């Protein structure tokens, strides 16, 4: 893996594949990329920042278990009484397994940044004409251990979300497909865009992925990191049609179930792509890129 040699300057092991401590060098570029993305935020956008956990009930309601049950991280804890908890602990001291006393909380680790925004939008009543636009971010989690630097279990996501009529969303989508590519170009990155599909689970997941790709509901900006034949999706646009509008009872200004769409930036993938492309010595980065990033 071509990326491996980047580890020494970017990451420290934390004893778990896909979970790394970030060096100051690495974080300085993550921060500049986030500032660049912010500088392209469109008018009328409301910014929200989500913690790394969210309501299990909200995620169940969003349909996540129908699509990616195998990817979800659930928060569990020792919920019993003092003796119950001490019993679990004692088993650990004894050389047994305390984890058998774990029971689920009402929380999961957020699998994507946008999920909490839909009930928040719904709570405000009908959408105004033109719809609503959100800027959301979260530390996300997906249970997919890997040693590859572009495949993490815990990673930062940044998203612009549009909630409105089908025309609102398609206008938003056309705009962000253009802007996402202009950003990658300004960063000096090599990419192509392709229609793609989410990693749906199961046999129904094969139909869902086929459907999604055939309908062109998901575009990805792909950057060669490991190789040119297996590039890495570093940005995406998802058109959800009326799926979340229906789920959450969001009505557009015409009284119809709202459509939603989002452009997603994988902050850790973009940072890794920058270092892979430009190296770990910032003073040598191309002058135009340094200027774009305010270096």
């Amino acid at each position: 893996d071509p990326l491996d040699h980047l580890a020494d300057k970017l990451f420290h092991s934390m004893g778990s594949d896909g979970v790394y401590a970030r060096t100051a060098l690495y974080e300085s570029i993550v921060e500049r990329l986030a500032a660049l993305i912010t500088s392209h935020r469109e008018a009328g956008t409301e910014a929200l920042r989500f913690p790394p956990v969210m309501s299990r009930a909200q995620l169940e309601k969003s349909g996540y278990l129908k699509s990616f049950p195998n990817l979800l991280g659930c928060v569990c804890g020792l919920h019993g009484t003092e003796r119950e908890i001490n019993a679990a602990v004692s088993r650990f001291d004894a050389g047994g397994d305390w984890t058998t006393s774990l029971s689920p909380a009402d929380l999961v680790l957020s699998p994507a940044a946008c999920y909490p925004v839909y009930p928040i939008a719904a709570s405000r009543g009908p959408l105004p004409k033109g719809g609503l636009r959100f800027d959301v971010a979260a530390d996300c989690f997906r249970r997919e251990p890997s040693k590859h630097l572009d495949r993490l279990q815990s990673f930062r996501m940044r998203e612009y979300v549009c909630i409105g009529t089908p025309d609102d969303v398609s206008d938003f989508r056309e705009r962000w497909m253009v802007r996402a590519q202009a950003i990658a170009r300004d960063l000096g990155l090599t990419f192509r865009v392709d229609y793609a599909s989410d990693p749906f689970f199961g046999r129904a997941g094969k139909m869902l992925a086929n459907n999604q790709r055939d309908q062109q509901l998901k575009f990805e900006l792909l950057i060669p990191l490991r190789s040119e034949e297996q590039p890495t999706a570093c940005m995406s646009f998802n058109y959800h049609r009326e799926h979340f509008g229906t789920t959450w009872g969001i009505q557009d200004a015409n009284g119809e179930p709202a459509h939603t769409g989002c452009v997603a930036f994988g902050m850790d993938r973009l940072a890794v792509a920058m270092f892979h492309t430009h190296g770990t010595d910032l003073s040598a980065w191309p002058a135009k890129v340094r200027d774009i990033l305010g270096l």
Binding site: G63, K66, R203, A204, K206, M207, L208, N210, N211, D214, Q215, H243
Partner: protein
Amino acid sequence: NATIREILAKFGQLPLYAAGLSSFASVQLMLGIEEAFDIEFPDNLLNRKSFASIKAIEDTVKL
């Protein structure tokens, strides 16, 4: 057709795309054709078009 007029009623959740046959409904409809009959679709004929109408579903079964 007699076997399909019960599958669409059980998993279709209609009030076929002009009706209320949604995506996650249609996949529970796909699975219901693998249950009432003894075959699993190929990834090729596994799609939106293969489940457009009632007469569309039936033809795919023979093939």
